[PDB]
Design an enzyme around this catalytic site. Sequence first.
Site, mmCIF file in Angstrom:
data_model
loop_
_atom_site.group_PDB
_atom_site.id
_atom_site.type_symbol
_atom_site.label_atom_id
_atom_site.label_comp_id
_atom_site.label_asym_id
_atom_site.label_seq_id
_atom_site.Cartn_x
_atom_site.Cartn_y
_atom_site.Cartn_z
ATOM 1 N N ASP A 1 50.807 -22.868 43.799
ATOM 2 C CA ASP A 1 51.216 -23.134 45.169
ATOM 3 C C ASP A 1 52.315 -24.200 45.205
ATOM 4 O OD1 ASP A 1 50.959 -24.278 48.253
ATOM 5 O OD2 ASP A 1 50.392 -22.186 47.961
ATOM 6 N N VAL A 2 52.205 -25.259 44.433
ATOM 7 C CA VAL A 2 53.273 -26.266 44.412
ATOM 8 C C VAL A 2 54.616 -25.631 44.088
ATOM 9 C CG1 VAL A 2 54.195 -28.305 43.208
ATOM 10 C CG2 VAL A 2 51.822 -28.256 44.021
ATOM 11 N N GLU A 3 54.702 -24.713 43.133
ATOM 12 C CA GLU A 3 55.944 -24.047 42.776
ATOM 13 C C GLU A 3 56.567 -23.259 43.919
ATOM 14 O OE1 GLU A 3 54.178 -21.901 39.620
ATOM 15 O OE2 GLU A 3 55.022 -23.156 38.027
ATOM 16 N N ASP A 4 55.747 -22.687 44.804
ATOM 17 C CA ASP A 4 56.262 -21.943 45.951
ATOM 18 C C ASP A 4 55.161 -21.774 47.002
ATOM 19 O OD1 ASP A 4 57.619 -18.622 46.556
ATOM 20 O OD2 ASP A 4 57.992 -20.522 47.559
ATOM 21 N N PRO A 5 54.953 -22.814 47.800
ATOM 22 C CA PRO A 5 53.906 -22.866 48.788
ATOM 23 C C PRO A 5 53.688 -21.648 49.646
ATOM 24 C CG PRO A 5 55.080 -24.958 48.787
ATOM 25 C CD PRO A 5 55.756 -24.069 47.780
#
Length: 363
Positions: free
Chosen positions: A73-77
């Site tokens: 999720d941090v990479e592409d919320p």
Amino acid sequence: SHSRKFLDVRSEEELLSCIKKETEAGKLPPNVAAGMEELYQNYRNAVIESGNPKADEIVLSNMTVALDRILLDVEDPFVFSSHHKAIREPFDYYIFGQNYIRPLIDFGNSFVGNLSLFKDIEEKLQQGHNVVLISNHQTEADPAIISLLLEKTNPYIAENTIFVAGDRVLADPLCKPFSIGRNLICVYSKKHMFDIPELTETKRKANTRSLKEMALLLRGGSQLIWIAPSGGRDRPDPSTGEWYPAPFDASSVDNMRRLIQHSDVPGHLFPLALLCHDIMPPPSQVEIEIRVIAFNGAGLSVAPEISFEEIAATHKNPEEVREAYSKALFDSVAMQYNVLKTAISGKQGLGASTADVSLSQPW
């Protein structure tokens, strides 16, 4: 492209190295990496402390998958808007949150109040009516407490309840995998609506959209929605350390009641109590003064709906009716909560049962 390095971790040394490497590549902010290490240590400690013989295996498995999904999720919320349906495929986020919270629940010291009413609730839903659970809120794992306690007797409630959820918890990187696996109605809280003046207009438009979609779902019938009118998680009294349901916002109960009225479909509001703060408590100064994750018994209760008509017929104006109806729901929630408390922290188990709250252990 998603780094799947957390899934290669086989030890604590590799875990910490992986966290470092993801941060160094700029794929993990330092405060999130720090939160991940704290999370690991606290989850590990609670599972080991439960006495679970498979503690090391459960911790490695749940924590390496949790870290991978948090990093994903941090990479592409994942962007949440209005109504969110739980994601069950290719990666079942629902079953992941269930398995993640399972080891923290001491089922031998957990209780359900008025189990038969959950069957009544399913009948009403089968008749096409809508049901709103008016509840207190204690932890960000509340949805899993409900689902795990009822998974054997009421799988329909476990998998299909829709939770009215606030922006603060939905933005947290550490809670996002859990949230993705639940059914939600996403709303911007009143509490934080005015914090950033340049976002208020946008939050208000999104809140209107969420209300509109919730109203449309109600028109269709058979919806089961949970809402905590307090908004936030219960906090311990700052002096005594006692935990109990936080004050409701009477307008939130009223807004739900009126949406039900305009939906043209029969709707029911039931007071629900949850007791699980010990498992994953919100931060508090009195708690420091007198652990973020722990193994503990959990409680869940429901009681019959409050007669709205009886209150409207005996109060002199709209405001007084709103306050009395909200208080009557709140009074029921607090009553059930103390019975759960006596069963669990009081150690009475089924002997804490009363005329109005009948306890059981459906597992």
